[PDB]
């Protein structure tokens, strides 16, 4: 029952919404592979410009509304580039503009990596024929819009097979029994329930060994040498 609504939200065939975006970005795995290989795409810039020629499409939508959000939020977000003290005044652009309609509505993680690439490639920008970060960035955004997951894609099933099929190739429970222990039974009784504890930078290794002994359970049996009942 789990599929993509036309609004990009993940709803069940019941109608119950499960996620508001696929992985929170609505990106298709079958597209992503090169979606973050910017330099290569650039070496084949003119070809991709021939695929995603914008002049056919630049007439049907807006390339600024999201870019405007990018200006106010990109400023304040670079101002807030501590985690729980978030830029709560600005949700990500994917919340504020249909990624299919205003080119530039992209995960902030992808936006940031892309800009940082454009800055780190000013020397590639000293190797181009004339390409600029607005023309290349515009192209890569258009790759992003054209890489989005289609309305109605059976992504629930796709997920499920993507977990089953590779699990055929298969101190704590690993592999299939572990996945079973989670996915299949949601067992409140792990076979090897563990809790990882970060120890402060100041915590010496010897203090840590003292604490390791100091926390472990100690049964009376553990100290008993001999019991004689007469």
């Amino acid at each position: 029952g789990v599929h993509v609504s036309y609004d990009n939200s993940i709803r069940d065939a019941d109608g119950t919404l499960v996620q508001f975006m696929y992985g929170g970005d609505a990106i298709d795995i079958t597209k992503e592979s090169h979606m973050t290989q910017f330099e290569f795409c650039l070496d084949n810039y003119y070809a991709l410009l021939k695929k995603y020629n914008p002049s056919a499409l630049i007439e049907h939508l807006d390339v600024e509304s999201a870019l405007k959000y990018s200006k106010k939020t990109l400023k304040y977000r670079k101002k807030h580039s501590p985690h729980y003290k978030q830029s709560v005044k600005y949700d990500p652009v994917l919340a504020k503009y249909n990624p299919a309609k205003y080119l530039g509505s992209v995960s902030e993680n992808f936006q940031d990596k892309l800009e940082s690439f454009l800055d780190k490639n000013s020397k590639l920008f000293k190797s181009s024929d004339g390409v600029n970060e607005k023309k290349f960035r515009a192209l890569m955004q258009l790759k992003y819009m054209r890489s989005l997951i289609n309305p109605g894609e059976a992504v629930g099933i796709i997920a499920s097979q993507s977990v089953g099929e590779p699990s055929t190739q298969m101190n704590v429970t690993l592999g299939i029994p572990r996945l079973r222990e989670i996915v299949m039974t949601a067992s409140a009784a792990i076979k090897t329930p563990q809790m990882t504890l970060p120890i402060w930078n100041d915590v010496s290794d010897e203090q840590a060994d003292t604490f390791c002994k100091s926390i472990s359970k100690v049964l009376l049996s553990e100290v008993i040498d001999k019991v004689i009942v007469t």
Partner: protein, 47 residues
């Protein structure tokens, strides 16, 4: 446990809204996913 779900369904007087892809298969209905996520109509000349 098909019969168990049968019992709880009848006792509820449940109505199937025919959403499950499987359930819809049971009734021989175009699946609602993908190409069945929508309907197609036709534009016809009125004059």
């Amino acid at each position: 446990t098909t019969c168990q779900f049968l019992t709880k369904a009848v006792l509820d007087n449940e109505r199937e809204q025919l959403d499950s892809p499987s359930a819809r298969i049971v009734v021989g209905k175009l699946n609602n996913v993908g190409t069945g996520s929508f309907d197609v109509l036709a534009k016809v000349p009125n004059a």
